[PDB]
UniProtKB/Swiss-Prot annotation, chain C:
The lineage of its organism: Eukaryota, Metazoa, Chordata, Craniata, Vertebrata. This is NADH-ubiquinone oxidoreductase chain 5. Its EC number is 7.1.1.2. InterPro entries: NADH_DH_su5_C, NADHpl_OxRdtase_5_subgr, ND/Mrp_TM, NU5C-like, Proton_antipo_N. NCBIfam families: NDH_I_L. GO terms for biological process: electron transport coupled proton transport; mitochondrial electron transport, NADH to ubiquinone; mitochondrial respiratory chain complex I assembly. It catalyses: a ubiquinone + NADH + 5 H(+)(in) = a ubiquinol + NAD(+) + 4 H(+)(out). The keyword NAD applies. Keywords: Electron transport, Membrane, Mitochondrion, Mitochondrion inner membrane, NAD, Respiratory chain, Translocase, Transmembrane, Transmembrane helix, Transport, Ubiquinone. GO terms for cellular component: mitochondrial inner membrane; respiratory chain complex I. Pfam families: NADH5_C (PF06455), Proton_antipo_M (PF00361), Proton_antipo_N (PF00662). Core subunit of respiratory chain NADH dehydrogenase (Complex I) which is composed of 45 different subunits.
UniProtKB/Swiss-Prot annotation, chain F:
It is found in: Mitochondrion inner membrane. PANTHER family: NADH-UBIQUINONE OXIDOREDUCTASE CHAIN 4. It is a multi-pass membrane protein. It comes from Ovis aries (Sheep). The keyword Cytoplasm does not apply. This is NADH-ubiquinone oxidoreductase chain 4. The chain crosses the membrane at residues 22-42, 60-80, 98-118, 147-167, 196-216, 224-244, 256-276, 284-303, 308-330, 351-371, 391-411.
Length: 104, 171, 606, 177, 87, 459, 101, 128
């Protein structure tokens, strides 16, 4: 491991964004960092915020339990979105319908 | 054995078995088998152990403490007398804790022995428990983890001051 | 007196002996499950003797045999209190565990870790019998946490499966909320009554006992899976079928109702707790029955069935009938365990296929399992002069002719009809009709262990309710003078439920396709309760556990204010001090300034 | 949209996947076999009615409307096979799947109980270490520059050699060890 | 419980369920009979055949492998790979 | 107390004149002999403490800490002999000498009757600990961790020295028995307020208190295994012991002056516990668990009831044992997989069954499973805080959830599931690691049988 | 880019290769066995067992049970002379001089 | 007709109901080809260094180290004190402390007032 592989500050110029997307092993137009609100996120990408239950259960992963691949940029809350924890998978009926029916 | 005056128990009253049927109950047969197969070898082994203990006899004694003057006759910041007064107070404190424990054990024994008539047949034990709990609470409560004889004396002085003042209001 | 205590503690020591036997092992044990089964059967006999003695005489005893810890005024000793409840609940649990272990030694034969499984089951039974025979609150708390941890381990038995780990952790969470309630009750009892033993609690008999009853009701809600803390009981059958047969059907889940049974004078001298726990029990039994109406997993159906039964136990506690609740525990354990053994037999005969839409036509193929399942369903519904009739119907006999909540009574009658409905749903879909399993047929039930254990629990579910109901002494005034339309309420409700559910199944036989409504999706997705909360309560915790506590406070602001602002201040002062250009002229100008300040302003020369 | 063989999913593949999941959900709703046969033949007729469609945007609109139909008509809990993901016994035996390299850490006292098995294991390891450099030298000369564009692997080209990266797909543990 | 499988047994099984199809003549098909090439079948008929395979052997074949099996011998090879037959 | 100081100081010629191959054997043997010798401090009386001379004494509070320290030294010697196997002999002897000096300073800190002697060796414990952390720590951040630890401790504890010298000038003595018999009440003034703050803040930092705990998740992580044992099992308890000693003189201002700090722990033990739910690091998880347990100890000391004091003593001993065992397990995993992150190595019950059993038992003792002394201490603190106020039980009960919610979580991701495929250097468990686990755990379960020897001086 | 002279990181050593009977204490087999014997002898059979025997037979720890015996005296006195079982004052109120007010 | 399904935070939109799946533009094909190329490169590297018979140890992952360094050691240098961070720190840092301090102070003041007036029931309370 070398010092240029660790995450750095928030990128502003397009060439720093390109180098960051090259660092995180993703396309330049697919790399969207967190907004620069000074919350310490830095240049870590903002993933589409889906649980690990939503991944393909039949494609052979490098980590079959985690449903993850070696070298893939993992989510900021991957320790939150594992299959042992909170799931975001779609439901047959709507969320507001469930809340209204249960509360009623 | 233990002393029956400290731990009181009423003489028991066991009814005679007067059966009304002809089927033999298994309890009597199992009891006879119990004094046959269990009680006899246990008692024989205990007799052998008791003979071996009677072969070699020695004694031990209950330690007695004489009375040292308490904190009320101790000069302030005179550690030589206050140390003895505080040691006596702590020994007394432990003794009173065990006294309250004995009364609690008496109350629980009364409740279990009486069974379904416990709230009538255990009035005396409950009154004794209330008296000893009231006196313990008036003697030792609200001192803290750093309790000492001086804090107990201050609490008692405040209680007697309050009692005298309340008497003076209603006189 | 000497035979009594000796035989009871022999039962306890005999139960704890094989744990030491396996822990001191070196070789490969020559069929350790047979050793455990023989030990538990012998302990069943040894505990049957003092139950017979109590039936003959009426002896209740308390053995404070080992003094443990004197916390000044408080004294804690190893105390066993054996009364009506403990002495009539120990042998029923031993008989059920004997049948469950025989079914386990048949069912789990291919497991290479079968010795660990039998040791875990023995440890759970040890903790349960520690719980039910405890006198002080510390020992009963020990049994409470022991059965919780053993439930965790037995649910997460298949530790490679993530669903088993999730279910075990969820059960731990709900049991720890029950532990919050139990801890609050113990706290009030120590602070206000200066005791943990039950004798002083019952003798002092407090009147302002709302808070300890609230804590005990919270603990019973957590352990027995009432409403609010229910979904761990259905969701925690990822483990083996003997585990679901012993843990979540007959023995562990009645611990909350047992705890409320032990504290029956405090509940009998308070109406607010009785009212709210009656309402909670009726809500639980209606909710779980309505969920079980449209379920398709057989073990999920039986889980909702036993949770509805626990709700009925809560209801009959709430109307000041605790001995009826204990009799219902002893009655319900038999046929609930037996139904789970029958379910496991069908699962094993169909190669681990648990969906009810892939089984059928098993009436003639598996006749003994069919007969036992039919008898168990009839006993669960409340067929007259079976075991359930000797408890469950009597509960309704007190539910009508008493000063109860009207809505609670109406929903528990609707719940009774729903129990009838899902019982015949199980019977129709599992047994009758035409086959739906794969073409290769490996149907077999000819093993001595499974047949013998099912036969033993069949004899139990046929006669034990009659035996216990005619052997226990009357602890209350039975209510029998009532009108004819209150006497036959339960039987008529069960019959009409049978008719409606038979009509429902016949309409499933019709050649029509219909889209599901909102009621079907509400009753199929578990009232939307494990879908909202299990997605909302973790999320609102875990982000709060990461964005605020982990990052914003500990990693940013507490790092900012105390050490780093100080470090920046000293760095800035150090840079300002040592920014000198090394010029003697400025140094001597500073000397002149210092002398002038000390003479004129600071007045150091006076 | 996530496949090891193709980058994307074609329209025919989407239609076939929709037909598969719709038939499975209909089988879930229609537990009895004859009723399922009636409505499965009805669904087959409904899929065969628009089979010969040549306008691509009309086929795409029909596909989207059929997806909306299916999502409105799901079973809240469909039937899952016991070993498929979401099933009752999915990944149950993964605690028993011990990898074979643990056999390298066995004591010689317990290795003496299985002589022929460990001789065969030694010859298998010898074959692997004999073929590994051939496999990697085949891997460098087959793929174009800039890295492989697909995850698919070449087979054993010449004679007397083994396919590249074969050890962890041949020596994988059994389903029921 | 769980009787062992064998290659000729599973081949007999897949052929036996294949001759029970009304779209297939039992006197023409062999173990290398393509569906839309040698038998003139359809893609939807291949999907129904794969669902029959799943309902016969009790395990579900994934779609990304269901779109590749085109002959009975390929289904035999896939079932043999997934069930680890002939140890 | 000279019968324990002299053999401890003679351990240095024992470890400096030994051969290059038998330093570990000799040091472990003689430290185990000293641990056996340590049992002669149980001669405690129901009224009077055990006074040896004018310089040393030991009541029933210091005795379990002394026994724990002299039992803990051989455990560190057995643990820290694998990552120093390739080390130079002179540096190995220097490491053993640092451990010996730390034990000597600790066991004469716990027995000093005079308060400034207690302060002097309470700060003499800084030097070997800091040297160990900054010398034999692995990664870059050991230097920053050492700076943070040293400066938090000293900047908190210099006003303690000023206040103690003020006490010596005012009361006339600093002997604890004389102060027990010459204690005067402290009235309400700003001078007494800052007197209380100066006496308390050193132990607040060393406890650690929430908001002053920032040196714990560094110094507990960058340090080696023996450094982790002393950091989690003695020094925090040393701060607690000093707090118990010095709260005697600060009455009755404490009855309001402890009002903020209790909140700073009552909420604090929530937040840090929640951190363990979202920690990517195993050692950091153990450190934050230590923060939560010691915050509970802080509340127990500050409400100053007898039940809280016995709960604090039992909790300190049990938490020291459990945290040391957990650090040993995490260090074994780090030695096997060469990374500290928790998610890298999974499913280790399939490969290491007995170490999985030790993991399960350690996690069960972490979440206060009855009848262990962890549950005894937690329970007694719960009773005392319920007597203090009612709503506190909520702040207890929620904690009783979250603790388990990380402990079993720590049990799952390290032991359950499917194992990592590419990690194939999982060697079978050595006899040394299993012996270390058993020597950590069996005294705890044996102490569950006879807990009355660790229930404080007012049992 | 040219970089400084530095030894590469050595490969991780396995103690079970050169010594399949290793206890994990040392590379030398005799030293390994003697260290294991020393640890197991002086830890389990010297400190643990004898320490448990010592703690189990402590001579009346903290005078505790002695107080119980004293209670069995005191109540036996105070139930025999008709005295109150416990007084509400720790010290004699006669010998306490309250301040006047 | 049919009720439209809308996404939520805890219930995402299904893949089959997403319009963006059905977009068959050439730019989407190029994007998916580049994503597949990146995935194939990473998979090839992983299973090249993973199938090696000589290697014994851990195949380290730069993404895991990147994630840990971003989660732990990169939070402070990318933090800037502004109105949002200061208001969040003051709201969630000293809010609950003040709230619980006021609650406990109020309860204990009421309890002490009741105790010193001889109103609270403290009959059997002798263990504190």
């Amino acid at each position: 491991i070398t010092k240029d592989m660790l995450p750095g500050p928030y990128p502003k110029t397009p060439e720093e964004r390109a180098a960051a997307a090259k660092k995180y092993n993703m396309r330049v137009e697919d790399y969207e960092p967190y907004p620069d609100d000074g919350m310490g996120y830095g240049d870590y990408p903002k993933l589409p915020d889906r649980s690990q239950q939503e991944r393909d259960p039949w494609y052979d992963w490098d980590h079959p339990d985690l449903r993850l691949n070696w070298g893939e940029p993992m989510h900021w809350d991957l320790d939150m979105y594992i299959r042992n924890r909170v799931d975001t998978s779609p439901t047959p009926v709507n969320w507001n319908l469930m809340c209204k029916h249960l509360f009623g | 054995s233990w002393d029956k005056d400290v731990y009181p128990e009423p003489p028991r009253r066991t009814p005679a078995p007067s059966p009304q049927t002809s089927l033999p109950n298994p309890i009597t047969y199992l009891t006879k088998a119990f004094d046959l197969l269990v009680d006899r070898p246990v008692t024989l082994v205990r007799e052998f152990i008791e003979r071996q203990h009677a072969k070699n006899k020695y004694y031990y004694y209950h330690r007695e403490f004489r009375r040292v003057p308490d904190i009320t006759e101790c000069h302030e910041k005179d550690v030589l007398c206050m140390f003895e007064a505080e040691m006596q107070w702590k020994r007394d404190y432990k003794v009173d804790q065990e006294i309250v424990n004995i009364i609690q054990e008496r109350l629980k024994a009364c409740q279990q022995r009486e069974g379904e008539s416990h709230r009538q047949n255990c009035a005396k034990e409950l009154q004794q428990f209330t008296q000893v709990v009231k006196a313990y609470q008036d003697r030792y409560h609200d001192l803290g983890a750093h309790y000492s004889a001086r804090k107990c004396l201050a609490k008692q002085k405040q209680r007697m001051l309050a009692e005298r003042k309340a008497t003076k209001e209603a006189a | 007196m000497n035979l009594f205590s000796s035989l009871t503690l022999v039962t306890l020591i005999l139960l704890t002996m094989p744990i030491a036997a396996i822990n001191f092992n070196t070789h490969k044990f020559t069929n350790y499950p047979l050793y455990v089964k023989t030990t538990i059967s012998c302990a069943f006999i040894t505990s049957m003797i003092p139950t017979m003695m109590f039936i003959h005489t009426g002896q209740e005893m308390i053995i404070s045999n080992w003094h443990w810890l004197t916390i000044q005024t408080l004294k804690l000793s190893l105390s066993f209190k054996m009364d009506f409840f403990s002495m009539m609940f120990v042998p029923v649990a031993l008989f059920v565990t004997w049948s469950i272990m025989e079914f386990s030694m048949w069912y789990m034969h291919s497991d290479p870790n079968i010795n660990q499984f039998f040791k875990y089951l023995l440890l759970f039974l040890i903790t349960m019998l520690i719980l039910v025979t405890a006198n002080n609150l510390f020992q009963l708390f020990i049994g409470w946490e022991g059965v919780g941890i053993m439930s965790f381990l037995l649910i997460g038995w298949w530790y490679g499966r993530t669903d088993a780990n999730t279910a075990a952790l969820q059960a731990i969470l709900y049991n720890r909320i029950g532990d919050i309630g139990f801890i609050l009750a113990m706290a009030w009892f120590l602070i206000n009554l200066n005791t943990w033993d039950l004798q002083q609690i019952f003798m002092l008999n407090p009147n302002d006992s709302n808070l300890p009853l609230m804590g005990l009701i919270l603990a019973a809600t957590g352990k027995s899976a009432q409403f609010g803390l229910h979904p761990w009981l259905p969701s925690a059958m990822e483990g083996p079928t003997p585990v679901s047969a012993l843990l979540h059907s007959s023995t562990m889940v009645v611990a909350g109702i047992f705890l409320l049974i032990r504290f029956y004078p405090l509940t009998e001298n308070n109406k607010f707790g009785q009212s709210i726990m009656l309402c909670l029990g009726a809500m639980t039994t209606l909710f779980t029955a309505m969920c079980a109406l449209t379920q398709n997993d057989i073990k999920k159906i039986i889980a909702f069935s036993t949770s509805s039964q626990l709700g009925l136990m809560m209801v009959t506690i709430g109307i000041n009938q605790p001995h009826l609740a204990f009799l219902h525990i002893c009655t319900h354990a038999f046929f609930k365990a037996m139904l789970f053994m029958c379910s496991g037999s069908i699962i094993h005969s169909l190669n681990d296929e648990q969906d009810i839409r892939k089984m059928g036509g098993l009436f003639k193929a598996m006749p003994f399992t069919t007969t036992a399942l039919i008898i168990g369903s009839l006993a669960l519904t409340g067929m007259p002069f079976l075991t359930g009739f000797y408890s469950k119907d009597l509960i309704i006999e007190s539910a009508n002719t008493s000063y109860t909540n009207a809505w609670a009574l109406l929903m528990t009658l609707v719940a009774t009809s729903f129990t009838a409905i899902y019982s015949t749903r199980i019977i129709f879909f599992a047994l009758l009709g035409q086959p739906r399993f794969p073409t290769l047929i490996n149907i077999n039930e000819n093993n001595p262990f499974l047949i013998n254990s099912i036969k033993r629990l069949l004899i139990g579910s046929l006669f034990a309710g009659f035996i216990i109901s005619n052997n226990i002494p009357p602890m209350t005034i039975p209510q029998m003078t009532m009108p004819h339309y209150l006497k036959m309420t339960a039987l008529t409700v069960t019959i009409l439920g049978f008719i409606l559910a038979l009509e429902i199944s016949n309409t499933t036989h019709y050649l029509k396709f219909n889209y599901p409504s909102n009621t079907f999706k509400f009753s199929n997705l578990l009232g939307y309760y494990p879908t909202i909360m299990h997605r909302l309560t973790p999320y609102m915790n875990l982000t709060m556990s990461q964005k605020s506590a982990s990052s914003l406070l500990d990693l940013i602001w507490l790092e900012t204010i105390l050490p780093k602002t100080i470090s920046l201040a000293q760095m800035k002062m150090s840079t300002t001090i040592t920014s000198q250009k090394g010029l003697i002229k400025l140094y001597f100008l500073s000397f002149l300034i210092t002398i002038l300040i000390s003479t004129t302003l600071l007045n150091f020369h006076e | 949209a996530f496949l090891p063989s193709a980058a994307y999913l074609t329209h025919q593949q989407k239609v076939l996947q929709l037909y598969k999941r719709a038939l499975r959900h209909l089988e879930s709703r229609c537990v009895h076999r004859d009723k399922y046969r009636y409505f499965a033949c009805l669904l087959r007729a409904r899929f065969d009615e628009h089979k010969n469609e040549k306008d691509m945007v009309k086929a795409t609109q029909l596909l989207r409307e059929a997806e909306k139909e299916f999502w409105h008509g799901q079973h809240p809990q469909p039937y899952i096979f016991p070993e498929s993901p979401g099933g009752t016994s999915y990944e149950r035996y993964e605690c028993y799947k011990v990898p074979e390299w643990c056999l390298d850490d066995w004591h010689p006292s317990e290795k003496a109980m299985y002589p022929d098995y460990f001789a065969k294991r030694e010859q298998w390891k010898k074959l692997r270490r004999e073929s590994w450099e051939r496999e990697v030298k085949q891997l460098q000369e087959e793929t174009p520059v800039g890295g492989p564009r697909t995850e698919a692997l070449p087979p054993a080209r010449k004679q007397g050699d083994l396919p590249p990266l074969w050890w962890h797909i041949v020596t994988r543990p059994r389903e029921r060890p | 419980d769980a009787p062992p499988l064998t290659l000729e047994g599973i081949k007999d099984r897949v052929l036996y369920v294949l001759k029970l199809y009304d779209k297939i003549d039992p006197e023409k098909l062999s173990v290398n009979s393509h569906f839309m090439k040698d038998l003139g079948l359809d893609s939807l008929d291949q999907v129904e055949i794969i669902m029959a395979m799943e309902d016969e052997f009790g395990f579900e074949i994934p779609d990304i492998d269901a779109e590749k099996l085109m002959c009975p011998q390929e289904i035999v090879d896939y079932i043999a790979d997934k069930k680890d037959v002939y140890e | 107390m000279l019968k324990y100081i002299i053999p401890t100081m003679m351990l240095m010629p024992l470890t400096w004149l030994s051969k290059n191959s038998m330093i570990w054997i000799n040091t472990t043997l003689h430290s185990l002999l000293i641990s056996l010798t340590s049992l002669l401090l149980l001669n405690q009386f129901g009224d009077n403490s055990l006074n040896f001379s004018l310089t040393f004494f030991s009541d029933s509070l210091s005795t379990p800490l002394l026994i724990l320290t002299m039992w803990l030294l051989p455990l560190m010697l057995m643990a820290s002999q694998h990552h120093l196997s390739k080390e130079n002999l002179a540096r190995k002897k220097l490491f053993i000498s640092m451990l010996i000096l730390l034990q000597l300073f600790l066991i004469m800190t716990f027995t000093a009757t005079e308060l400034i002697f207690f302060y002097i060796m309470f700060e003499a414990t800084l030097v070997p600990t800091l040297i160990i952390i900054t010398r034999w720590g692995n990664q870059t951040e050991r230097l920053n961790a050492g700076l943070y630890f040293l400066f938090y401790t000293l900047a908190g504890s210099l006003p303690l020295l000023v206040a103690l010298i003020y006490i010596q000038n005012t009361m006339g003595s600093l002997n604890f028995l004389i102060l027990q018999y010459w204690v005067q009440p402290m009235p309400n003034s700003w001078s007494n307020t800052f007197m209380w703050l100066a006496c308390m803040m050193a132990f607040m930092v060393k406890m650690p208190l929430y908001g002053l705990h920032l040196w714990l998740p560094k110094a507990h992580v960058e340090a080696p295994i023996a450094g982790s044992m002393v950091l989690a099992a003695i020094l925090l308890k040393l701060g607690g012991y000093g707090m118990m000693r010095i709260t005697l003189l600060l009455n009755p201002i404490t009855d309001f002056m402890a009002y903020p700090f209790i909140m700073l722990s009552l909420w604090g033990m929530i937040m840090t516990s929640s951190i363990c739910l979202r920690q990517t690091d195993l050692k950091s998880l153990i450190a934050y668990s230590s923060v939560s347990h010691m915050a509970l100890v802080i509340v127990a000391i500050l409400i100053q009831t007898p039940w809280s004091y016995m709960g604090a003593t039992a909790l300190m001993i049990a938490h020291g044992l459990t945290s040391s065992m957990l650090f040993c397990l995490a260090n074994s995993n780090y030695e096997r997989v060469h990374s500290r992150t928790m998610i890298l190595a999974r499913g280790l019950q399939t490969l290491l069954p007995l170490m999985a059993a030790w993991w399960l038992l350690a996690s069960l003792t972490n979440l206060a499973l009855p009848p262990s002394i962890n549950l005894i201490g937690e329970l007694f603190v719960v009773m005392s805080t319920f007597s203090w106020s009612n709503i506190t039980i909520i702040l207890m009960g929620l904690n009783m959830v979250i603790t388990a919610l990380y402990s079993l979580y720590m049990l799952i991701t390290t032991q359950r599931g499917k194992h990592t495929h590419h990690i194939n250097n999982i060697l079978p468990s050595f006899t040394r690691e299993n012996a270390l686990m058993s020597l950590h755990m069996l005294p705890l379960l044996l102490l569950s049988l006879n807990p009355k020897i660790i229930l404080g001086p007012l049992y | 880019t040219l970089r400084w002279q530095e030894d590469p990181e050595p490969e991780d050593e396995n103690l079970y290769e050169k010594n399949p009977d290793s206890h994990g204490y040392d590379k030398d087999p005799a030293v390994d066995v003697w260290n294991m014997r020393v640890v197991f002898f002086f830890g389990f059979s010297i400190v643990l067992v004898l320490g448990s025997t010592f703690v189990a037979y402590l001579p009346d720890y903290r005078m505790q049970e002695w107080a119980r015996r004293e209670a069995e005296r005191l109540v036996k006195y105070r139930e025999a002379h008709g005295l109150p079982l416990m007084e509400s004052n720790c010290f004699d109120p006669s010998k306490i001089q309250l301040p006047e007010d | 007709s049919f009720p439209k399904y809308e996404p939520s935070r805890l219930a995402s939109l299904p893949t089959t109901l997403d319009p963006a799946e059905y977009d068959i533009s050439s730019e989407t094909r190029k994007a998916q080809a580049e994503r597949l190329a990146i995935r194939s490169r990473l998979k090839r590297e992983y299973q090249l260094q993973y199938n090696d018979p000589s290697r014994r140890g851990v195949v380290e992952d730069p993404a895991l180290i990147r994630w840990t360094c971003a989660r732990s050691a990169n939070v402070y240098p990318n933090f800037r004190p502004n109105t949002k961070t200061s208001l969040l720190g003051a709201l969630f840092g000293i809010g609950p402390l003040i709230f619980w301090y006021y609650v406990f102070k109020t309860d204990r003041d009421r309890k002490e007032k009741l105790i010193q007036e001889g109103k609270l029931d403290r009959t059997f309370n002798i263990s504190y």
